[PDB]
């Protein structure tokens, strides 16, 4: 949707699909670090690292280098999905716990 | 109706062209202009 | 041949390691490919307190990256409403105009930011959709009914101190419906805005817009939202005989509960969570060898304290949803190619 | 000059505890007990009231 508040991908020297650098705009260490943690769980990626280009700017660079087969854009799109699944589960669990505690406290 | 408050009397004197700049009810020689209601915009940052 | 899977051990001259050994390939067999069911099974949330303006849930079984993401969302990405523009018709106060505007920006408004929207760039006017307007108009006069007294409230006082009570909401559009009479108001009615003397007057219109605590702190919805790993304390040896009390004094007092099992006194670790890390045992030179204090690996303790705009549990919910929104925005922008 | 509205390091709102602080000190309470009875736990907030110098009361004494 947004042509540049979001993704700009730079395929490496030789446009290796297995080595991509994603530029994520308007992002700081929050999404960078959580998404790097979620992408490291994939045994098909050999190098994942994020970095902020400069303090004055608001953008991060992820670097995903996967193994021989997959195009390194599936690891990214799967780390996103797993992180969103974890957030949904945490939200459900937290709301259920808050409700249970409110009941336990309002009864007594 | 340009008002000026005296320095220590605090009487509203209206001064113009060609007239001296002393204050009535006293004789001091310093008079502060008055704040009128005019709209100004400030940012809360 | 000794594994310690759950604690961050620690001495005095420094902590031992910075790892958690729960990632892919981090062990011979203890390898990871993000089993989602193992997460959903080992995760549990526990809330220690929930007054209004406080929460202390536990959030057991999550990594430091996700916990830090949640903490940084509450401080800088959950949206709030706050004064952005100030129109000053007259101001004969001692407090300056720019300083008054600043002081007015840092006052928290009780409007919920989820019913509003962001003003488009250059939308100076604003509309019922994105703005709330409030008016402070106060003048100080001597009270005619006063004796020869000197208390500032009794005399020289109709409005000596301008408070947040003096601020009145001007319903901008159809906002009178939607918002009942007392709903949109400043959160605190006692915040001292200025001080006046007879003949001095304040008169202004404040405009409140939506925004996140990232582009200015005034829009931030929590006092603090930090977290701390759950401490762990282990008595390697049975402490007794008046060394138990010296042990119980080298810790936050509730942590080591000295029971009396026999005629002698035994110290026991009653509640490890109360401990503040002060490392005062390490000055004892005889009991630094008896106790090992470390941190539990992925067992956190959170503490969210809102200013009053939204309840803390709603704040945490909206933080988790903001992280989900980031993830979904990037997923859907990826799907755009 | 006047009480800061929010504590600088944290942001906690301390601009409504000035008169309450002054009232608990007139009642005989130490500055420690007084800052406790107001809810100022962490010392970043406690320094915001403990070391405040109210100079709005000395500027509000020269003629209008
Ligand atoms: Zn005069
Ligand atoms: Zn503070």
Swiss-Prot record, chain A:
Instruction: Please provide, alphabetically and separated by semicolons, the GO molecular function terms listed in this UniProt record.
Output: DNA binding; DNA-directed RNA polymerase activity; protein dimerization activity
A GO term (biological process) for this protein?
transcription by RNA polymerase III
The opening ranks of the lineage are:
Eukaryota, Metazoa, Chordata, Craniata, Vertebrata
Renumbered to this chain, the signal peptide range is none
Protein keywords: Acetylation, Disease variant, DNA-directed RNA polymerase, Nucleus, Transcription
> Subunit arrangement?
Component of the RNA polymerase I and RNA polymerase III complexes consisting of at least 13 and 17 subunits, respectively. Pol I complex consists of a ten-subunit catalytic core composed of POLR1A/RPA1, POLR1B/RPA2, POLR1C/RPAC1, POLR1D/RPAC2, POLR1H/RPA12, POLR2E/RPABC1, POLR2F/RPABC2, POLR2H/RPABC3, POLR2K/RPABC4 and POLR2L/RPABC5; a mobile stalk subunit POLR1F/RPA43 protruding from the core and additional subunits homologous to general transcription factors POLR1E/RPA49 and POLR1G/RPA34.
User: What function does this protein fulfil?
Assistant: DNA-dependent RNA polymerase catalyzes the transcription of DNA into RNA using the four ribonucleoside triphosphates as substrates. Common component of RNA polymerases I and III which synthesize ribosomal RNA precursors and short non-coding RNAs including 5S rRNA, snRNAs, tRNAs and miRNAs, respectively.
What GO cellular component term, any one, is given? RNA polymerase III complex
| Protein family | Belongs to the archaeal Rpo11/eukaryotic RPB11/RPC19 RNA polymerase subunit family.
Protein name according to UniProt: DNA-directed RNA polymerases I and III subunit RPAC2
Q: Where in the cell is it found?
A: Nucleus; Nucleus, Nucleolus
Could you tell me which species this protein originates from? Homo sapiens
UniProtKB/Swiss-Prot annotation, chain B:
Q: What is its main location?
A: nucleus
Which residues are listed for Zn(2+) binding in this entry? 6, 9, 23, 26
Any one Gene Ontology BP term: regulation of transcription by RNA polymerase I
* GO MF, one annotated term: zinc ion binding
Give the location in the cell.
Answer: Nucleus; Nucleus, Nucleolus
* Keywords in alphabetical order: DNA-directed RNA polymerase, Metal-binding, Nucleus, Transcription, Zinc, Zinc-finger
Where are the C4-type-classified zinc fingers?
6-26
Recorded GO CC terms: cytosol; nucleoplasm; nucleus; RNA polymerase I complex; RNA polymerase II, core complex; RNA polymerase III complex
In the record, the note on similarity to other proteins reads: Belongs to the archaeal Rpo12/eukaryotic RPC10 RNA polymerase subunit family.
Q: How does it assemble?
A: Component of the RNA polymerase I (Pol I), RNA polymerase II (Pol II) and RNA polymerase III (Pol III) complexes consisting of at least 13, 12 and 17 subunits, respectively. Pol I complex consists of a ten-subunit catalytic core composed of POLR1A/RPA1, POLR1B/RPA2, POLR1C/RPAC1, POLR1D/RPAC2, POLR1H/RPA12, POLR2E/RPABC1, POLR2F/RPABC2, POLR2H/RPABC3, POLR2K/RPABC4 and POLR2L/RPABC5; a mobile stalk subunit POLR1F/RPA43 protruding from the core and additional subunits homologous to general transcription factors POLR1E/RPA49 and POLR1G/RPA34.
What protein name applies here? DNA-directed RNA polymerases I, II, and III subunit RPABC4
Q: Which organism is it from?
A: Homo sapiens (Human)
The uppermost taxa in this organism's lineage are: Eukaryota, Metazoa, Chordata, Craniata, Vertebrata
Corresponding gene? POLR2K
From Swiss-Prot, chain C:
Gene Ontology CC terms, in alphabetical order: cytoplasm; cytosol; fibrillar center; nucleoplasm; nucleus; RNA polymerase I complex; RNA polymerase III complex
Q: Does the keyword Iron-sulfur apply?
A: no
GO MF annotation: an example: DNA binding
Localization: Nucleus; Nucleus, Nucleolus; Cytoplasm, Cytosol
- One example of a Gene Ontology biological process annotation: transcription by RNA polymerase I
Q: Which family does it belong to?
A: Belongs to the archaeal Rpo3/eukaryotic RPB3 RNA polymerase subunit family.
Known function: DNA-dependent RNA polymerase catalyzes the transcription of DNA into RNA using the four ribonucleoside triphosphates as substrates. Common component of RNA polymerases I and III which synthesize ribosomal RNA precursors and short non-coding RNAs including 5S rRNA, snRNAs, tRNAs and miRNAs, respectively. POLR1C/RPAC1 is part of the polymerase core and may function as a clamp element that moves to open and close the cleft.
Q: Which PANTHER family match?
A: DNA-DIRECTED RNA POLYMERASE (PTHR11800), DNA-DIRECTED RNA POLYMERASES I AND III SUBUNIT RPAC1 (PTHR11800:SF13)
**Name of this protein:** DNA-directed RNA polymerases I and III subunit RPAC1
Which organism is this entry from?
Homo sapiens
**Taxonomic path:** Eukaryota, Metazoa, Chordata, Craniata, Vertebrata
UniProtKB/Swiss-Prot annotation, chain D:
| BP GO terms, sorted | regulation of transcription by RNA polymerase I; transcription by RNA polymerase I; transcription by RNA polymerase II; tRNA transcription by RNA polymerase III
Give Gene Ontology CC terms.
cytosol; nucleoplasm; nucleus; RNA polymerase I complex; RNA polymerase II, core complex; RNA polymerase III complex
Q: Where in the cell is it found?
A: Nucleus; Nucleus, Nucleolus
* MF terms (GO), sorted A to Z: DNA binding; DNA-directed RNA polymerase activity; zinc ion binding
Its chief place of residence is nucleus
Provide the alphabetized UniProt keywords.
DNA-directed RNA polymerase, Metal-binding, Nucleus, Transcription, Zinc
Q: Which domain of life is it from?
A: Eukaryota
Q: Which positions bind Zn(2+)?
A: 7, 10, 44-45
Alphabetical list of InterPro entries matching this protein = RNA_pol_su_RPB10, RNA_pol_suN_Zn-BS, RPABC5/Rpb10
Q: Which Pfam families match?
A: RNA_pol_N
Write down the PANTHER family for this protein, in alphabetical order: DNA-DIRECTED RNA POLYMERASES I, II, AND III SUBUNIT RPABC5, DNA-DIRECTED RNA POLYMERASES I, II, AND III SUBUNIT RPABC5 FAMILY MEMBER
Task: State the protein's purpose.
Answer: DNA-dependent RNA polymerase catalyzes the transcription of DNA into RNA using the four ribonucleoside triphosphates as substrates. Common component of RNA polymerases I, II and III which synthesize ribosomal RNA precursors, mRNA precursors and many functional non-coding RNAs, and a small RNAs, such as 5S rRNA and tRNAs, respectively.
Q: Which family does it belong to?
A: Belongs to the archaeal Rpo10/eukaryotic RPB10 RNA polymerase subunit family.
Report the HAMAP family cross-referenced here.
RNApol_arch_Rpo10
Protein name from the UniProt record: DNA-directed RNA polymerases I, II, and III subunit RPABC5
